[PDB]
Design a protein around this ligand. Structure first.
Ligand code: KIN
Length: 272
């Protein structure tokens, strides 16, 4: 826009500057090119019932910056249809990736690195007192040299699979949702820690669906009296001990991300 103008927004960019394309199977995200720089990018778009919510996401994205969080390049919220441009992550989402990778190339060390990256992003978000709400591998993205960034798709309605079910005013990744949050709709950074713990598990197992076989309805009950996923084949003892600490029934017991990242750094440096 216009610098002197009263509504100047650095992030608002020319909608013509982006050569929209086809969908990256998802709201809806297509893949786009930013002609100016010949760079492929991710464009998230929206007569729908969540405008206050979209622009909110835009707004937030404008406040966060970190090497391990998907990067917002610009927006298009001056005139509809509403856009949201972020860098593209050639490898798509962490969960499929883990399911279609060459495990010789994606060994234990690499998997330990991915967790370290993710933990680092969460430490930031924790420092900025920001609550993710839906941390999980389907929500992390994969780039070159095993670069992993944390994101948010708003998979809630995009998905209905069996991943998400109704609790509160909507759907919730039951298997990723912490106790307190399933029972009181209490979401905190400690709730994200829980989910992280699960995401770890997703990582340890190259992308296997959590609490396999178990039905959503019974998840809480089990966790209630202290039941947990078992260490996955190949997972180091120290990693696993970590998951458990994340999975403590009392939020205040769960380690901070600052602590979680400090533990990984020490492990990832000891292994490379
Ligand atoms: O991530 C967000 N939007 C988004 C847009 C496009 C996407 O698609 C895609 C992009 C790149 N490469 C491939 C695909 C994926 C996610 N929004 C968001 C809201 C709140 C918090 C965060 C976080 F803390 F995680 F950073 C992010």
């Amino acid at each position: 826009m216009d610098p002197s103008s009263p509504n100047y927004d650095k992030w608002e960019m020319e909608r013509t500057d982006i050569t929209m394309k086809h969908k990256l199977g998802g709201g809806e995200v297509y893949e786009g090119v930013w002609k100016k720089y010949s760079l492929t990018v991710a464009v998230k778009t929206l007569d729908t019932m969540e405008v206050e919510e979209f622009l909110k996401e835009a707004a937030v994205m404008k406040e966060i910056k970190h090497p391990n969080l998907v990067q917002l390049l610009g927006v298009c919220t001056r005139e509809p249809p509403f856009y949201i441009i972020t860098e593209f992550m050639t490898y798509g989402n962490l969960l499929d990736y883990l399911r279609e990778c060459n495990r010789q190339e994606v060994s234990a060390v690499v998997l330990l690195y991915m967790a370290t990256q993710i933990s680092s992003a969460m430490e930031y978000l924790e420092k900025k007192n920001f609550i993710h709400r839906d941390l999980a591998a389907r929500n992390c993205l994969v780039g070159e040299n095993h670069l992993v960034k944390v994101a948010d798709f708003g998979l809630s309605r995009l998905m209905t699979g069996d991943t998400y079910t109704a609790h509160a005013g909507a759907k919730f990744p039951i298997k990723w949702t912490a106790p307190e949050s399933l029972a009181y709709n209490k979401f905190s950074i400690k709730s994200d820690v829980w989910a992280f713990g699960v995401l770890l598990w997703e990582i340890a197992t190259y992308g296997m669906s959590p609490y396999p076989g178990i039905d959503l309805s019974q998840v809480y009950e089990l966790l209630e009296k202290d039941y947990r996923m078992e260490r996955p084949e190949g997972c180091p003892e120290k990693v696993y001990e970590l998951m458990r600490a994340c999975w403590q029934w009392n939020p205040s017991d769960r380690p901070s991300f600052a602590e979680i990242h400090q533990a990984f750094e020490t492990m990832f440096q000891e292994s490379s």
